[PDB]
Subunit: 80 residues, 6 copies
Amino acid sequence: GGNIILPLALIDKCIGNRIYVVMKGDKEFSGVLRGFDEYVNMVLDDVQEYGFKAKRVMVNRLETILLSGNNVAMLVPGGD
Amino acid sequence: NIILPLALIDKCIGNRIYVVMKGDKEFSGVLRGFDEYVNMVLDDVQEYGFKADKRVMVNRLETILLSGNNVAMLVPGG
Amino acid sequence: GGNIILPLALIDKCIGNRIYVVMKGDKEFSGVLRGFDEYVNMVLDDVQEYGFKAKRVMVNRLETILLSGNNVAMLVPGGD
Amino acid sequence: NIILPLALIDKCIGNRIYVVMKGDKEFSGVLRGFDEYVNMVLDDVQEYGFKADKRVMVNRLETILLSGNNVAMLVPGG
Amino acid sequence: GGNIILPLALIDKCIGNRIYVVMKGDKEFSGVLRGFDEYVNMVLDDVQEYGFKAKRVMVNRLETILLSGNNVAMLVPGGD
Amino acid sequence: NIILPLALIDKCIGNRIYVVMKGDKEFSGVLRGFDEYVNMVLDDVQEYGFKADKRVMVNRLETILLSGNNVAMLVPGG
């Protein structure tokens, strides 16, 4: 049959790459992925955080963050 | 015929499904893989959304992960 | 003492029957239950989805859905 | 006397309790059984709700399951 | 190194004491803690519930409640 | 150098971090301990909040527990 791509294997392939993470509650990040665990907690470097003010606006740059996997909506490998 | 939810998803592997997330985001896409949390990997994705003006396509995406913590409902072949 | 009815045993008794599921976020379904797991993920056939537009309005019919147990608010055996 | 939350619920089996869910739904009902997730089965249920016009009874229900993912607070004999 | 204070050890130290619990969704309680588990479910006695009507208003007194750990935002040992 | 999220937090023990919770509460504080759920104990805390008038300090607190179910993001030395 097809190739099966498990979720945690997809994320694993993302390490070293700039990814885009959409978090619940209208906050979005672009960052390079350094690690993750089974809960889909992630460590991003070189981050840009985007929000939505009155469309998509950058609201911050940061060196390093942790994003909580309990708060992730969607991840986009390749980063946009 | 008792159908386990995971066995329903498993049958959809390589097919298009329709996924209604929490927060009125909806995604049509080809299911590539999944886990017991209903974390899913979708390809060939159209993102729908809701705009004051019905349901509008607001995006096209390739390989994503949708967080199972954030899924509401899944329509096999929707 | 009384009869104890465990939650997963209640759902088990629902198999084959039309149930009513209230999901978080003002979406409601009536469907025949075909399976479920320990997370309260469910497979419904013959479904009517109701929402709330400006009271309770039917918004869709579907053949088969999966409802995520992480998003369930309440289940009503017998279906209304 | 340390009281484990589950041992508090266990004592309520066969009695009326008051359950405040997430999202301003509230339920008075007779507790029939439960699990460690605070999934609960309630009988003889009155559903309260909030309406612009206080707390209004918006429904009467028989045997339900209330999802523990969605519970905020539980009042023994409320 | 420093003293490490694990979350469940902090709560353990609170038993017998009046604590303040902020729950998600703008509801707050002050109560004496009688028990808790690994999910951060808690049993409070002698409770005051505060809400926010049009600032912080007391909305109820209760003898005993259970607060669901899935709905806790923050706990404050010492109680304000 | 693969960095596990828990190993990132572990390095912050005894240092100030910045924690963005769900619901637009934000907390600067000294990390005292944590668990795999990202439950955390913070000291010497300033609570920020959002007020129609930017980001306003709305409180000062001592030893709290922040619920990991309710964390969005964590900035080491923010």
